[PDB]
Amino acid sequence: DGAPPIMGSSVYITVELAIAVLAILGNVLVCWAVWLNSNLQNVTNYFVVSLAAADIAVGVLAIPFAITISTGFCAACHGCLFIACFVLVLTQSSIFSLLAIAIDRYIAIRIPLRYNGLVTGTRAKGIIAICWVLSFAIGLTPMLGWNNCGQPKEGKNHSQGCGEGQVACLFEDVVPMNYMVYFNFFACVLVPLLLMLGVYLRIFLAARRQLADLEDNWETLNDNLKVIEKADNAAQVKDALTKMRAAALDAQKAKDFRHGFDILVGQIDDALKLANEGKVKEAQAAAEQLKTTRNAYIQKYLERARSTLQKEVHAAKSLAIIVGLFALCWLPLHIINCFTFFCPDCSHAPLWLMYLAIVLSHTNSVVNPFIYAYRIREFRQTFRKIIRSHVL
Ligand SMILES: CC(C)CCC[C@@H](C)[C@H]1CC[C@H]2[C@@H]3CC=C4C[C@@H](O)CC[C@]4(C)[C@H]3CC[C@]12C
Ligand SMILES: CC(C)CCC[C@@H](C)[C@H]1CC[C@H]2[C@@H]3CC=C4C[C@@H](O)CC[C@]4(C)[C@H]3CC[C@]12C
Ligand SMILES: CC(C)CCC[C@@H](C)[C@H]1CC[C@H]2[C@@H]3CC=C4C[C@@H](O)CC[C@]4(C)[C@H]3CC[C@]12C
Ligand SMILES: Nc1nc(NCCc2ccc(O)cc2)nc2nc(-c3ccco3)nn12
Ligand code: NA
């Protein structure tokens, strides 16, 4: 007695197939958008496409494999291992793509003038190819001998009636838990996720430091202007102009734009030469000209630089959400494996919970297209064009 297994199995399979359809459709849309729209064709989005391709493969291959292995069918043990482990190749490829995106955005905010000479489409393609090769080697490592094929469950294999060399193909019977916990979870998943967390933290800190510096230079200009306006001594004017000048050079370091800071620094130097030669009123008078240069050029370039940095912060937040949802969808299965491995006195997690955790991991292959659509205008607008035109 006990409910016929096919009833629970029918629910599981139906849900897996629903997820597969949505993973394929949404991620084909991502790839189509990058293909269509040259504004989306940049290095960051080559990693986005590599990630979308891994999620298409979850729907086309990993989900049919998961349905197959849920039956415990008789198979040659190394064929069984390939079906069991292929999803780990795809999840490792996703991890590498996510890590590359984070580093890409970190380079872009740290050394933006060197970014385009360092990070090229050709180098990115080589990186993607290497990461896919490494992904196959890591995810299929059990097929090199780190497996339980030498210790078959002969009770299961006779009750199912399997032949010679065949095992009942069940994940936990063939894939060792020490591989899943120490090698896959700790070294290959958790360590990269923590590195990604640290990279994103460094991105937000760099942005916050650059914004504060911008602001410091701005009020250094304005404060020292007031000093000159309230001064009554040549060297109180000269000293303020001197500090205004370094602030201006630092702002310029950090063509029409050049004309702005040239008028500004030229005007400072004019007022300085008057200051040195004792003419305080001529110096103060020359220094009030700076205000129209400030209003006409310097404020406009402060504003553009602030909004560029605010755009990069908003973009990095969007990409970090992707990483967060990856962790939220995969950590339950890893944590369950930790209980199975480290607590032999604990009852095994129940079968319904195992399959809920499996389904949750697969749902990760559905969500990224929705993030892009809600958070990234250029994707959203291109999705809209594709749907309205080629679908409506
Ligand atoms: C989509 C196309 C391009 C490639 C798909 C190939 C897949 C379906 C092939 C490649 C290797 C194959 C496996 C190789 C060995 C075995 C062991 C046997 O006892 C049962 C079948 C099984 C488990 C095969 C199932 C089908 C399989 C997984
Ligand atoms: C990352 C977020 C979503 C947290 C998810 C935590 C989940 C995976 C945790 C919270 C409570 C945990 C359960 C607590 C108690 C037991 C009983 C034990 O005999 C087997 C493990 C099992 C069944 C745990 C499995 C993992 C578990 C379900
Ligand atoms: C969230 C990320 C950053 C860290 C993940 C922490 C994981 C590794 C932690 C959280 C809860 C922990 C489990 C809590 C309780 C037990 C029961 C004990 O008898 C064996 C260890 C075991 C099973 C722990 C293993 C490690 C564990 C799963
Ligand atoms: N532990 C585990 N089991 C399964 N499937 C088998 C579930 C099960 C567990 C016990 C049992 O007697 C019958 C079925 N798939 C699994 N996939 C993973 C996985 C992928 C990434 C991290 O863990 N872990 N994992
Ligand atoms: Na993925």
Numbering used by the authors: -2 to 208, 1001 to 1043, 1059 to 1106, 219 to 308
Reproduce, without paraphrasing, sentences from the article in which this PDB structure was first reported.
To demonstrate the general applicability of the described Complex-LCP method, we applied it to four other GPCRs: serotonin receptors 1B (5-HT1B) and 2B (5-HT2B), adenosine A2A receptor (A2AAR) and melatonin receptor type 1A (MT1). A2AAR is another prototypical GPCR, which similarly to β2AR has a large number of available ligands. A2AAR has been crystallized in complex with many different ligands, including the relatively large antagonists ZM241385 and comp-1, the agonist UK-432097 and some smaller, high-off-rate antagonists such as XAC, caffeine, PSB36 and theophylline. For example, in the case of A2AAR the transient ligand LUF5834 is likely to be exchanged with ZM241385 before crystallization, as no crystals were obtained when using LUF5834 alone.
